[PDB]
Amino acid sequence: XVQFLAXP
Amino acid sequence: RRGSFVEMVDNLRGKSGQGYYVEMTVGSPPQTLNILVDTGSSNFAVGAAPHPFLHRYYQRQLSSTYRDLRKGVYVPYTQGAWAGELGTDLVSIPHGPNVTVRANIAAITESDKFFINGSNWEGILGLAYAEIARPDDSLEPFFDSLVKQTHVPNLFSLQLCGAVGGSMIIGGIDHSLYTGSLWYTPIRREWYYEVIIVRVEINGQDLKMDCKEYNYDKSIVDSGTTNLRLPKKVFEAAVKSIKAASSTEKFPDGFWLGEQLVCWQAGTTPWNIFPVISLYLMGEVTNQSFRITILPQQYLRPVEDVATSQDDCYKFAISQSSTGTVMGAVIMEGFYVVFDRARKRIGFAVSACHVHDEFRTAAVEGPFVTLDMEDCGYN
């Protein structure tokens, strides 16, 4: 696998 | 003889590499859902419409206490994204603290690469701070609401047990979950749970990079990420050093890139040929640090292999990042981790449940002397 917050 | 927080012990479940989840009860009458625990974000959200990978979902029309906020919300992750609708409703955690709070909840109506086929979870609980909440920092995160509405102390702790289970103690610390001492590192800033890494060693050997590289452009503790992720330059030097340390055995280039698996006959994995890895963290006193050390049992993850098979297959679970260091489950599974929000610090102690063997164990040791640690942080 899990890949949790992105800046997009 | 049982501790005060005994009813919270073993309240987490999961499938390896698929996150850890806790049961949460929402609405009135009760609708119980499995919720992924994610210290790497700040939105509480739940599946609220049918989806091929969901066995159950939140039915707002059946909850008499549901309140529509009349506002859409969108959350993108490193991988995955969902869109939904904001509201509030009553929320309790059956195997958590004995309180009920009115919380913000995002009802997920559409998603892409978010839910996982057969993971058993149906939503996500973002445990980080308001600064990174969507649509903005005015949307109070679950843990903020809990602390504001109730007596529950502003602290929680996580014990993730790899292979899947563990404990999330809310409002305190359970001493049966760890051995030895707790060592604390300051939370540099309240957005993600950001920390400062001051040195890295592979089998006792210093990687010898400028500490600024370890934290470019941030270092965070994130329970919703499987891997230990490292900035590109750090990843390359680490792989170089891990290869050199395990040289009595050869693996294809793609193994180190996570693109190829290697499998051993059941019960024969040569753990001993892989080195241990140590990260030193900034301590609570000037020029003082401590180190946490993990085993290959943490950074080589088994891939199921659900049905009984003759072969134990593994993936290398350290990978590269363009967004700084992420201490994911690979790190957390070795340790009991205390998110001490009240004192702006994160504690680490050796986990009572971490996977190890008869020759080596994960470790937390200090104190060490490290100079100029303040300069390590990205500005």
CB spacing of B18 vs A2 below 8 angstroms: yes
Distance, in Å, from the CA atom of B61 to the CA atom of B105, rounded to the nearest integer, reads: 14
Residue listed under structure tokens 């490290």: B370
Q: Which residues of B touch A (CB under 8 A)?
A: 17-19, 36, 38-42, 75-80, 116, 124, 126, 128, 132, 192, 222-227, 323
Say if residue B367 is preceded by a cis peptide, omega within 30 of 0: yes
- Contacting residues for B139 by C-beta, under 8 A, at least 6 apart: B43, B73, B86, B104, B130, B133
- Which residue pairs from B372-377 have beta carbons closer than 8 angstroms and sit at least 24 positions apart in sequence? B373/B196, B373/B198, B373/B211, B373/B282, B373/B287, B373/B289, B375/B211, B375/B212, B376/B196, B376/B197, B376/B198, B376/B211, B376/B212, B376/B214, B376/B215, B376/B282, B377/B188, B377/B196, B377/B215
Query: Which residue out of B18, B77, B113, B330 would a mutagenesis test of the A interface target, given it has the greatest number of A Cβ atoms within 10 Å?
Result: B77
- Stated length of chain B: 379
Distance in Å, alpha carbon of B290 to nearest chain A alpha carbon:
27
Cβ-based neighbour number of residue B242 at 10 Å: 20
Best CA proximity match to B313, nearest among B324, B322, B326, B304: B304
Do residues B324 and B217 touch, judged by C-beta distance below 8 A?
A: yes
Domains observed in chain B: 20-152 (2.40.70.10), 153-379 (2.40.70.10)
Do residues B170 and B156 touch, judged by C-beta distance below 8 A?
A: yes
- Contacting residues for B26 by C-beta, under 8 A, at least 6 apart: B32, B33, B46, B58, B63, B89, B90, B91, B105
Instruction: Specify the resolution in Å.
Output: 2.1
Residue listed under structure tokens 């370890």: B214
Distance, in Å, from the CA atom of B83 to the CA atom of B13, rounded to the nearest integer, reads: 26
